[PDB]
């Protein structure tokens, strides 16, 4: 606050402005048709050859399994949009029935770096200096300037990291894929460097299994990104066109009796502060 002498009037201070960015959710429809060829054959929750359960009750079993499975797939798509918005700042919503649009969040382009840890002579201080430079450019461009506490590595990024060198975290102990390696103190000074390693593999839309984390790169992201998950309107006779998490639906055709079963939701994962992360590529 500005000093003036207690005789003079005083000094007038300027203000600052806004930015507004608007978004739209993407729409999702998975379904299963239910033939007679799925209600008749045996399932594991059966009495092994004796029909103690009706085939109506076997229909109820396979319907409950399919509803649990659509819940599973909608949650997987939430995870995938979350990882895309955390890494790239843009999400590339492709699909078999959906053209490629590119919902950009306004990541600063200087945050998405490209360095190299393969040349001879790279030390442990060079890699930590690269991460610290990434933390510098995050703490400059951010609105609140929040220091980063986390560095999420891929598989080969952690391999190239260790091969050159030489409670909240207790909620991820039984869990496959994501393992807290350990807080390295180092010579950062501005931030502490927790290390995660993310090696989850999700099935792609071509069923060619890919990594949820870009494995040849480093993402570092604080919890001050503070995103909000979004859900648009469910364009359907059921629920009256409103907005929900997702919405299962069932109808049928008369002859032959082929019941249909469709869930539909409109997810979108939006960071409300996109300059609170960076994507550091370390390999080819």
């Amino acid at each position: 606050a500005p000093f003036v002498a207690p005789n003079v009037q005083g000094r007038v201070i300027k203000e600052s402005g806004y930015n507004t960015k608007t978004f739209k959710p993407a729409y999702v429809k998975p379904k299963h048709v239910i033939d007679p060829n799925m209600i008749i054959p045996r399932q594991p929750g059966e009495a092994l050859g004796t029909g103690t359960l009706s085939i109506a009750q076997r229909r109820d079993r396979v319907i409950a399994y399919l509803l649990m499975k659509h819940r599973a797939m909608h949650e997987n798509t939430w995870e995938w949009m979350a990882a895309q918005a955390a890494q790239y700042g843009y999400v590339d919503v492709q699909g078999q029935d959906y053209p490629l649009v590119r919902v950009d969040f306004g990541r600063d382009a200087a945050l998405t770096m490209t360095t190299d840890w393969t040349a001879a002579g790279v030390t442990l201080m060079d890699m930590i200096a690269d991460l610290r430079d990434g933390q510098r450019l995050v703490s400059d461009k951010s609105m609140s300037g929040t220091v980063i506490r986390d560095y999420v590595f891929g598989g080969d990024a952690w391999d190239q990291f260790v091969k050159v060198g030489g409670n909240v975290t207790r909620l991820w102990d039984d869990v496959e894929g994501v393992q807290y390696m350990g807080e390295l103190v180092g010579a950062n000074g501005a931030g502490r460097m927790r290390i995660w390693v993310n090696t989850q593999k999700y099935r792609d839309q071509n069923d060619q299994e890919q990594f949820l984390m870009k494995q040849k790169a480093v993402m570092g992201i604080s919890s001050a990104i503070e995103g909000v998950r979004c859900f648009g309107a469910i364009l359907d006779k059921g629920a009256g066109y409103q907005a929900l998490d997702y919405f299962p639906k069932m109808w049928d055709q008369e002859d032959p009796s082929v019941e249909y079963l469709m869930s539909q939701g409109a997810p979108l994962m939006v960071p409300a502060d996109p300059n609170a992360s960076f994507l550091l590529t370390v390999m080819s």
Binding site: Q9, K14, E15, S16, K21, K24, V93
Partner: protein, 124 residues
């Protein structure tokens, strides 16, 4: 405009800024006068030989023309032949005004208005 966008995407809606004008607590003096050229918003004006309101520009003619002595800051935009309400009082912001080329620094902008009711001061 007939078909809605069923897809996903982003849209930039805009960026507001405040435009503070005042830098002090002096009183405010306003007057209306007919304009001769087109006048923008918060632009520095003078008076030509006809008594109109030409926006301010030094280096005008062997003889300093009456456009070279600035008088007041405009407030609402007008065309030629229209009249302009313009401030003659108060203490004003530096960069929120209409200054042209070769009048960039702070010292020349106060050297325009050393004497009047109008003072030009920085914000913080």
């Amino acid at each position: 405009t007939s078909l809605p966008n069923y897809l996903a995407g982003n849209g930039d809606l805009g960026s507001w800024e405040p435009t503070q004008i005042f830098a002090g607590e002096a009183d405010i003096v306003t007057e209306g006068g007919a304009a001769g050229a087109d006048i923008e918003i918060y632009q520095v004006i003078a008076k030509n030989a006809a008594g109109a309101m030409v926006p301010h520009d030094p280096t005008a003619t062997e003889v300093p023309a009456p456009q070279s002595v600035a008088i007041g800051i405009a407030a609402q935009p007008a065309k030629s032949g229209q009249n302009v309400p313009y401030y003659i009082g108060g203490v004003f912001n530096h960069a929120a005004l209409g200054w042209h080329a070769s009048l960039d620094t702070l010292a020349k902008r106060q050297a325009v208005f050393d004497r009047t009711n109008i003072h030009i001061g920085n914000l913080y």
